[PDB]
Design an enzyme around this catalytic site. Structure first.
Site, PDB file in Angstrom:
ATOM      1  N   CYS A 257      -6.498  -7.961  -8.316  1.00 27.52           N
ATOM      2  CA  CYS A 257      -5.145  -8.357  -8.688  1.00 27.52           C
ATOM      3  C   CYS A 257      -4.882  -9.804  -8.308  1.00 27.52           C
ATOM      4  CB  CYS A 257      -4.130  -7.448  -7.998  1.00 27.52           C
ATOM      5  SG  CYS A 257      -3.923  -5.850  -8.776  1.00 27.52           S
TER       6      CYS A 257
ATOM      7  N   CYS B  23       1.164  -6.420 -16.922  1.00 29.44           N
ATOM      8  CA  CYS B  23       1.362  -6.851 -15.541  1.00 29.44           C
ATOM      9  C   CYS B  23       2.715  -7.537 -15.417  1.00 29.44           C
ATOM     10  CB  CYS B  23       0.240  -7.783 -15.104  1.00 29.44           C
ATOM     11  SG  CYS B  23       0.377  -8.260 -13.376  1.00 29.44           S
TER      12      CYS B  23
ATOM     13  N   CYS C  79      -2.009  -4.395 -16.388  1.00 30.59           N
ATOM     14  CA  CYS C  79      -1.738  -3.928 -15.028  1.00 30.59           C
ATOM     15  C   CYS C  79      -2.658  -2.738 -14.764  1.00 30.59           C
ATOM     16  CB  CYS C  79      -0.263  -3.555 -14.857  1.00 30.59           C
ATOM     17  SG  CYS C  79       0.188  -2.916 -13.215  1.00 30.59           S
TER      18      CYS C  79
ATOM     19  N   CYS D 241       0.827  -1.209   0.000  1.00 36.44           N
ATOM     20  CA  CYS D 241       0.000   0.000   0.000  1.00 36.44           C
ATOM     21  C   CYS D 241       0.863   1.261   0.000  1.00 36.44           C
ATOM     22  CB  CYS D 241      -0.963  -0.002   1.187  1.00 36.44           C
ATOM     23  SG  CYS D 241      -2.056  -1.442   1.276  1.00 36.44           S
TER      24      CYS D 241
HETATM   25  S1  SF4 Z   1      -2.590  -5.776 -11.822  1.00 35.93           S
HETATM   26 FE1  SF4 Z   1      -1.829  -5.805  -9.672  1.00 35.93          FE
HETATM   27  S2  SF4 Z   1      -0.190  -7.386  -9.685  1.00 35.93           S
HETATM   28 FE2  SF4 Z   1      -0.592  -6.869 -11.867  1.00 35.93          FE
HETATM   29  S3  SF4 Z   1       0.933  -5.234 -12.339  1.00 35.93           S
HETATM   30 FE3  SF4 Z   1      -0.981  -4.168 -11.692  1.00 35.93          FE
HETATM   31  S4  SF4 Z   1      -0.701  -3.833  -9.452  1.00 35.93           S
HETATM   32 FE4  SF4 Z   1       0.850  -5.396 -10.061  1.00 35.93          FE
END
Ligand code: SF4
Ligand code: SF4
Lengths: 387, 389
Positions: free
Chosen positions: B332, B283, B325, B23
């Site tokens: 996530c 991601c 992402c 966080c």
């Molecule tokens: S979706 Fe979540 S795990 Fe994937 S890159 Fe974004 S913040 Fe990181």
């Protein structure tokens, strides 16, 4: 209930639900080559494809050739007839001698453009050229007149809601019931053996059957697939997960028929919404949205909040993925789709989380816009595959 | 194995494997707001938070610690009710007041910008006083007021030129400090498992997905529990370690084997992160941590087999490439669940290199994945444009 809705949905179902013999791109190549009308295939002494087409046809099996690539498609077009159109590879007798003959003379060149298939010279000296252009498969040089639907009807279908699809699958015409049964027939016949069976649970069978049917469509088998929007793998992704979930549960005929019908409605809607071409895997996304809506309808019935939650979890789960060309590995991607569906039947995701939409409609809208954003990647894909 | 290789690997492992309380984006927002040091938050007339595309993306739907809330407005309220001297821990020991949230909601005007990390707060009160604060570039450096905080490439490049054989030989002569690092990693990540998030059976992959998603959900909802991160990406570390932990839990129950496999996973994850040198909206956590995890899983199932690891990498590259992402979120975890799938599916399927973007071996697979990540570019601006609705 309503009349215009039933007729529009019925017409679009009769339109989008077709039978495609394997990959459409090798079929188009073979059709163009047969349009060249080479009298003696062994007398040849010229193919131009766009990035997406060359990508999709680089490592896909050609029907009735037991081979992969564009050269088998060209040889099959040489051994085919124009009158078979997209089914140019029907009734042929594959000759390894002609494949070895054409390998030394087939000079292929890729271009960055929409759909473009342009073809040959013989020993005499005569040259025969043919061209098929535009997204709708429109022949420009052979001019052999021969699916389309005007924009107004597509727009009216885009103005439908999930409630309209829920009401349509309660008043199904007999022709549409038989169409669903024939769809299940054609796509279930694609299951041949085991491809990814890692258990005896529900999702194990789902992944197994879906990957097996996709692999069957990929390896060049002479078995048609009931496709929606001429993307066979999309139809497999939309139908087979629901078929295998029903196999591992109630074994219900009408319930599975209605669930697959709602899946197809959702798939057609999503494809209409994703109006732009994309290098993001549209088959996985759209077929999986259809399949997850059908699975949620099978699990929870006519429940709007459950379907919204399923769409939200799907949007959060597997959004954005490369369409790196028709391949044996594509099945694996569809397998992931199965996961994305099953996981969405047991998870709730708040609307604030990222690109997730507020409901079914907004989920589809956001996914379509991101597909538009990922843009033209086929050029770099073809550059990668050539090495 | 060679000596310079072992020393470099030990240094890079002790460097990249850190402890991140997660966080970090809401923490940065709250710290920037608390730098204004508002004595009475209820005298504010208008707040103007400015974030870059990446910051607004990652902090839009992440839980804030000790607030039990999601979003940027809870982080702003927590910064208002915090002290600047707490730095990134502005949210510790607080008592969230719904009344202050309802007050600030009417006045918090947030604006997005196309830039690196940028968090600038500009608050005005009823009296007329204006309080400005700014944090630019890295996290730890506040510019308004000027409390500066500064964040080698040769080691990264030398690590890029290594082979999988170097990683396999290193996990045979591991220093004790690195063994303790791996064990502490497994401890920290197993302690992140709180309940069930996606458990639909008692089989192996059920446990894998369940535990991974449970620990990710624990890290996401803003619990004040640290996570053992690789390259300061906590979700990447979860994706790299937990699938292997859960496969070992549902199989042989081997200690040293799991230690070696998770170490190899971290090595592969760090290597993949080094190769994907350019930023991406793809991601990176899922991709890199899952490559590490699938290499570790292949090492646990089939051992030191080059063809087996090549096949696992090929099937993984063919399986789930190019996921978005879309910001740190509860969802996530779901993506990480997919990663588990992408890893396990690679342990029983072989995909030829001809199939699409797949490379001829592990090295080429990672190279193609990194190049596609580099091609996808930023795209975060349009992502926030979508999220704003
Ligand atoms: S979706 Fe979540 S795990 Fe994937 S890159 Fe974004 S913040 Fe990181
Ligand atoms: S990834 Fe999807 S869209 Fe791309 S070729 Fe495979 S099935 Fe078709």
């Amino acid at each position: 209930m309503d009349d215009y809705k039933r007729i529009l949905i019925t017409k679009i179902l009769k339109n989008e639900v077709t039978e495609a013999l394997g990959c459409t791109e090798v079929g188009l190549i073979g059709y163009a080559v047969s349009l060249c009308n080479i009298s003696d295939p062994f007398s040849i002494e010229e193919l131009t494809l766009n990035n997406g087409s060359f990508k999709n046809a680089y490592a896909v099996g050609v029907p009735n050739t037991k081979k992969y690539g564009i050269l088998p498609a060209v040889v099959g077009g040489l051994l085919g007839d124009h009158k078979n159109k997209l089914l140019v590879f029907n009734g042929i007798k594959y000759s390894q001698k002609l494949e070895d003959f054409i390998k030394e003379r087939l000079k292929i060149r890729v271009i960055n453009s929409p759909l473009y298939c342009g073809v040959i010279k013989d020993n005499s000296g005569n040259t025969f050229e043919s061209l098929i252009k535009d997204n709708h498969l429109n022949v420009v040089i052979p001019k052999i007149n021969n699916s389309e639907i005007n924009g107004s009807e597509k727009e009216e279908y885009k103005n439908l809601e999930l409630l309209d699809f829920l009401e349509y699958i309660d008043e199904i015409p007999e022709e549409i019931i038989q169409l669903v049964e024939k769809t299940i027939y054609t796509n279930n016949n694609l299951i041949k053996g085991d491809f990814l069976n890692f258990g005896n649970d529900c999702l194990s069978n789902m992944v197994n059957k879906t990957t097996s049917a996709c692999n069957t469509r990929m390896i060049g088998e002479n078995m048609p697939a009931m496709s929606v929007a001429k993307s066979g793998n999309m139809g497999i992704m939309a139908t087979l997960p629901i078929i295998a979930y029903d196999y591992s549960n109630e074994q219900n005929q009408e319930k599975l028929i209605k669930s697959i019908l709602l899946s197809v409605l959702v798939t057609i809607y999503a494809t209409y919404k994703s109006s732009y071409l994309s290098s993001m895997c549209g088959a996985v996304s759209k077929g999986g949205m259809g399949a997850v809506i059908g699975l949620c309808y099978y699990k929870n019935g006519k429940n709007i909040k459950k379907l919204d939650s399923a769409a939200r979890t799907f949007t959060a789960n597997l959004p954005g993925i490369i369409c790196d060309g028709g391949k044996v590995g594509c099945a694996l991607k569809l397998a992931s789709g199965c996961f994305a569906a099953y996981s969405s039947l047991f998870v709730d995701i708040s609307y604030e989380n990222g690109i997730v939409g507020k409901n079914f409609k907004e989920c589809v809208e956001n996914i379509s816009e991101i597909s538009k954003i990922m843009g033209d990647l086929d050029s770099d894909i073809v550059k990668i595959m050539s090495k």
